[PDB]
Design a protein around this ligand. Sequence first.
Ligand SMILES: OC[C@H]1O[C@H](O[C@H]2[C@H](O)[C@@H](O)[C@@H](O[C@H]3[C@H](O)[C@@H](O)[C@@H](O[C@H]4[C@H](O)[C@@H](O)[C@@H](O[C@H]5[C@H](O)[C@@H](O)[C@@H](O[C@H]6[C@H](O)[C@@H](O)[C@@H](O[C@H]7[C@H](O)[C@@H](O)[C@@H](O)O[C@@H]7CO)O[C@@H]6CO)O[C@@H]5CO)O[C@@H]4CO)O[C@@H]3CO)O[C@@H]2CO)[C@H](O)[C@@H](O)[C@@H]1O
Length: 375
Amino acid sequence: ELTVYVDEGYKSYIEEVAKAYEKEAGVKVTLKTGDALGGLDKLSLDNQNGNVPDVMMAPYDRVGSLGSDGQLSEVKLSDGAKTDDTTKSLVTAANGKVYGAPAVIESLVMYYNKDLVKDAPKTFADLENLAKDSKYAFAGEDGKTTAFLADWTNFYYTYGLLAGNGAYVFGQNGKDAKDIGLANDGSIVGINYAKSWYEKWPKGMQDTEGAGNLIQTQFQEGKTAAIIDGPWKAQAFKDAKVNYGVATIPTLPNGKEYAAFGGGKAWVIPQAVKNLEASQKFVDFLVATEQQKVLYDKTNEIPANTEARSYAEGKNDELTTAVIKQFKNTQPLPNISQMSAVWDPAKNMLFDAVSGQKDAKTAANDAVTLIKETL
Ligand SMILES: OC[C@H]1O[C@H](O[C@H]2[C@H](O)[C@@H](O)[C@@H](O[C@H]3[C@H](O)[C@@H](O)[C@@H](O[C@H]4[C@H](O)[C@@H](O)[C@@H](O[C@H]5[C@H](O)[C@@H](O)[C@@H](O[C@H]6[C@H](O)[C@@H](O)[C@@H](O[C@H]7[C@H](O)[C@@H](O)[C@@H](O)O[C@@H]7CO)O[C@@H]6CO)O[C@@H]5CO)O[C@@H]4CO)O[C@@H]3CO)O[C@@H]2CO)[C@H](O)[C@@H](O)[C@@H]1O
């Protein structure tokens, strides 16, 4: 009498937690598996028919947009959830009602192959030097490298590059939707720097679709020293038996930190659930210290619950350490409605600039005009 919709990578986790929740309270938790973002895309239509899962996971930006749009029930933050000021703020929409319980904090980090390299690269000049070295030449197209790869046409990925250089999405720390900073001078240096890398990379890095699969394949097959990716990738890398280390993203050519979004995920409850109390109850259990520790144990993702998070910090694995440092150098993932209009124009900006189809400034100005349109 309760259904949880999650990504495959959480199946084992939810199976175990369900088994315990059934023992503690008297509720049967059945799981439905599928694309997380895709489940949220259809939420509005599922709310129309009543056929919604009882609990699902959302990135914080989507907690804000889906919440602001009426698609989500309000969520209560129990004492057991062990939230802090920053995780509370990440699940509070502009209105500002609470539409999720914090489950994960995350930042992009640098994964590197310990079989290929002795130490973590520290600067972007280090990554550029690996580009020079010849075991990383790409077959069939030269002179291209796979020494360092990042999915820099995904705005979530590139953002930190632009922001480290002075770019911003919205003014007043992601709140002022009228002041867009994606076409400032710093943003343009970020974009131009991105371009220089695309000019050293396989043309497939510019593919309209699966650059993500190319990156993953190259790294797992021992062809790339370093990539930038999220903690969610860890389960897969362990499966691929990759001998990976994790470090903070190397400092930029300007010496500044790669200022990735300070993001993560919450447990959310669709607006159309039969029984909100029952859903809140399982959510309280999921964010309770024990289940949050088990989340770290099963996925290596960093718990939002501050007690469970200290546990992960104590475990002191390279990934947790890097996520924690990196999170100090982030600005929070914006959760105002208007963020939802940013991702697509920004992605097109990046494709157009790095391919040289538009110059960087023009691509940015065009992206900003289109974002301005949508809000
Ligand atoms: O090689 C290209 C591409 O390949 C992969 O991407 C796949 C996806 O796996 C698959 O889901 C689908 O993507 C669809 C997507 O399903 C649609 O919803 C839509 O995506 C929109 C989205 O709806 C918008 O909200 C906005 O997304 C933002 C997002 O809201 C924001 O939070 C952030 O997302 C990052 C997130 O916060 C992180 O947690 C993480 O998400 C992980 C989870 O942690 C993990 O638990 C599990 O669920 O997988 C998630 C990854 O899917 O990373 C997120 C960043 O990747 O930023 C995004 C913007 O990126 O905008 C998007 C785009 O308009 O459309 C897309 C595309 O049709 O199909 C693609 C294949 O193309 C790979 O994952 C990706 O990195 C590669 O770039």
